[PDB]
Structure formats: C-alpha cells, structure tokens
C-alpha cells in the first residue's frame, strides 16, 4: 500500500539482506548435499586416451 508526502533515503551499497541472502543460498546449497554421495573411492589411476574421432 502506498505512502505519501514521504522522503526516505535508500542505499543498495550499505544495504544488508544481500549479506544474509548470500549466506542462506550457500547454506541451502550445502543442505542439498548431505543426502548425496561422496566419491572418495574414485580418485584412482586413469588409463586415458583420445576419443574415437
């Protein structure tokens, strides 16, 4: 709802809520990995070669 006869100074640069949002997104990013699977047995010697082309 609108507000009238009103002067308010804003700032995006000294603004908060980008800080805790940058916290929260990486936090939920890590919450999306604890069910998932590690690859600790996979780091091993690799016999690699060029693809058929």
């Amino acid at each position: 709802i609108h507000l009238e006869n009103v002067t308010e100074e804003f700032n995006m640069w000294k603004n908060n809520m980008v800080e805790q949002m940058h916290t929260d997104i990486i936090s939920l990013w890590d919450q999306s990995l604890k069910p998932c699977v590690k690859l600790t047995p996979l780091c091993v010697t690799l016999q690699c070669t060029n693809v058929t082309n």
């Binding site: 709802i1 609108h2 507000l3 009238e4 006869n5 009103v6 936090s27 919450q31």
Partner: protein, 132 residues
C-alpha cells in the same frame, strides 16, 4: 476501484499525514506488531524476539498508569524547553518522523519522570484509601 480510505486505514498508511489525523488509527499498527531442519531455529528466535519486544512495551505501559487504554494521560507538565512549539502547529503541521527526530534527544528523562510521578500517585492513593 478499491477506494483510497482503505489504504489510508492500511498498515503504516498514515505515516505521511499530520499526527492529529494519524491519531485516528493505532490499532492496525498494534495488531500488525504482534504476530501477523535448521531453519526453524532462526524462525523461532525471530518469533520470540518479537514477543520479547511486545512484552517489554506492555511492561513499560504497565509500570505507567495505563495498560490497555492505548491513549493515556499523566500528571507531569510539558517542559517548554523541550519543544517551544505552538500547540496549534504540532497537530496539523508535522509528521511523526520529524516529531521523533525533534524529541529524540529528550529521552529517558520523561520515562523516569512518568515512573516517579505515578509512583508518587500510587503512594498518594494508598494513603487516601488507608485513611478511609
């Protein structure tokens, strides 16, 4: 098509008006103050911080003379050194924001004065009902 009086009566709608006309609504502000795996912790401390604030303000009114009246009076006169403004101009000229930034230095004096004045009122009322 919705009407302008409704958003006048909305939450924080009267922030720009004069304080005399902003007196006609406080209940919406008061009502929207109260309530309306890891994350619920943050949710929960936010909710209890809000009710801690609400109880602090209710206690500050409770130690004062008025509990649920929401519009009060007292028995300490206004020091003209605080404001020296005309009585006509304050209700029809200024907003609450600039009123707050004017009187914002004169704080915690008036609080203790209200405490003292109604403590004296309590002992006077106790004395009057003790003699009777």
């Amino acid at each position: 098509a919705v009407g302008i009086g409704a958003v006048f009566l909305g939450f924080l709608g009267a922030a720009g008006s004069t304080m005399g006309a902003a007196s006609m609504t406080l209940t919406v502000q008061a009502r929207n103050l109260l309530s309306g795996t890891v994350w619920g912790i943050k949710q929960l401390q936010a909710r209890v911080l809000a009710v801690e604030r609400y109880l602090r303000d209710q206690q500050l009114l409770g130690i004062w003379g008025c509990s649920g009246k929401l519009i009060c009076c007292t028995n300490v006169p206004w020091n003209s050194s605080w404001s020296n403004r005309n009585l006509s101009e304050i209700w029809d000229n200024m907003t609450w924001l600039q009123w707050d930034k004017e009187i914002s230095n004169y704080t915690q004096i008036i609080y203790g004065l209200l405490e003292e004045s109604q403590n004296q009122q309590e002992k006077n009322e106790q004395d009057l009902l003790a003699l009777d």
